[PDB]
Design an enzyme around this catalytic site. Structure first.
Site, mmCIF file in Angstrom:
data_model
loop_
_atom_site.group_PDB
_atom_site.id
_atom_site.type_symbol
_atom_site.label_atom_id
_atom_site.label_comp_id
_atom_site.label_asym_id
_atom_site.label_seq_id
_atom_site.Cartn_x
_atom_site.Cartn_y
_atom_site.Cartn_z
ATOM 1 C CD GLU A 110 -1.158 2.951 -7.214
ATOM 2 O OE1 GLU A 110 -1.943 2.752 -6.266
ATOM 3 O OE2 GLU A 110 -1.061 2.177 -8.183
ATOM 4 C CG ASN A 168 -6.326 -4.661 -0.836
ATOM 5 O OD1 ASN A 168 -5.215 -5.139 -1.054
ATOM 6 N ND2 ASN A 168 -6.611 -3.382 -1.052
ATOM 7 C CG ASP A 212 -6.738 -9.346 0.012
ATOM 8 O OD1 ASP A 212 -6.748 -8.278 0.657
ATOM 9 O OD2 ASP A 212 -5.800 -9.663 -0.753
ATOM 10 C CB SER A 219 -3.695 -7.730 1.562
ATOM 11 O OG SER A 219 -3.997 -6.837 0.503
ATOM 12 C CG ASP A 263 -2.909 -1.814 -1.681
ATOM 13 O OD1 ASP A 263 -2.266 -2.870 -1.860
ATOM 14 O OD2 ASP A 263 -4.058 -1.632 -2.126
ATOM 15 C CG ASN A 309 -0.972 -6.082 -1.340
ATOM 16 O OD1 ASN A 309 -0.760 -7.268 -1.106
ATOM 17 N ND2 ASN A 309 -2.123 -5.491 -1.052
ATOM 18 C CG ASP A 336 8.605 -9.551 -8.819
ATOM 19 O OD1 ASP A 336 9.520 -10.370 -8.614
ATOM 20 O OD2 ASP A 336 7.406 -9.802 -8.592
#
Length: 129
Positions: A35, A46, A48, A50, A52, A59, A101
């Site tokens: 990662e 990203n 969009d 956003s 990480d 994120n 989650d």
């Protein structure tokens, strides 16, 4: 900071990640490896808007507050900048929530692509923690 393989394993174990939710330590080390390459300052923006953050590339959309939408989401209750600290406490604690989650470690694409289905024990080989 860039962690050593066993140095990170030791730290993660210290924070109770070994076998957390049935996920062996090697899984977490392997995840961090692909990662962020063990880099606590790793950041991925990203297409969009956003980002990480950190060693586990968490994120900003759901897990932390990046100052753009206070009072919204931020499930880990922490500023995203906290995920960039050399102290992995915040990243590990947030990861515990993420892994609980409902999607297990599949929430980490690098893990599902390079770690899943392999002998992750190799990641703690020689550490003898």
């Amino acid at each position: 900071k860039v962690f050593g393989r066993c140095e990170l394993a030791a730290a993660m174990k210290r924070h109770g990640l070994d076998n957390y939710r049935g996920y062996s330590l090697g899984n977490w080390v392997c995840a961090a490896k692909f990662e962020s390459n063990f880099n606590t300052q790793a950041t991925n923006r990203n297409t969009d808007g956003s980002t990480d953050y950190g060693i586990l590339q968490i994120n900003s959309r759901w897990w932390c507050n990046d100052g753009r939408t206070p009072g919204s989401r931020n499930l880990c209750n922490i500023p995203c900048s906290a995920l960039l600290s050399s102290d992995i406490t915040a990243s590990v604690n947030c990861a515990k929530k993420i892994v609980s989650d409902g999607n297990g470690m599949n929430a980490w694409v690098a893990w599902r692509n390079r770690c899943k289905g392999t002998d992750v024990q190799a990641w703690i080989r020689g550490c003898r923690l």
